[PDB]
Amino acid sequence: MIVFVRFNSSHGFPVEVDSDTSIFQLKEVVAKRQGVPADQLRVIFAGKELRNDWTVQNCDLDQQSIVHIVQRPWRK
């Protein structure tokens, strides 16, 4: 499924993910895509960060508004 996500340094882009794609895995996916430090990557859904170990499907990242992702790197 395609989830809507807004990166701090990007726009609202669509990311295709699998139903079994874990939230942390998705974090790592976005980190991979734009080459950002996942350890310093902050994902926001409904205001809070989602559990790192669970399916992205059952977390409603495609249903409940748009996902916000911001990076907080110390050196970049």
What does this protein look like?
- Residues 1-76 form the Ubiquitin-like domain.
- The structure is a monomer.
- This protein is of the alpha+beta class.
- The chain has one domain: Ubiquitin-like (UB roll), CATH 3.10.20.
- The protein has one helix spanning 23-33, and strands at 2-7, 12-16, 41-44, 67-71.
- It has a four-stranded mixed β-sheet, with no helix packed on it.
- A hairpin with a 4-residue loop joins β1 (2-7) and β2.
- The radius of gyration is 11 Å and the shape is globular.
- It starts with a strand and ends in a 5-residue tail after the last strand.
In summary, what is this structure?
The chain has 76 residues and is of the alpha+beta class.
What is this structure's SSE topology?
Layout: E1 2-7, E2 12-16, H1 23-33, E3 41-44, E4 67-71
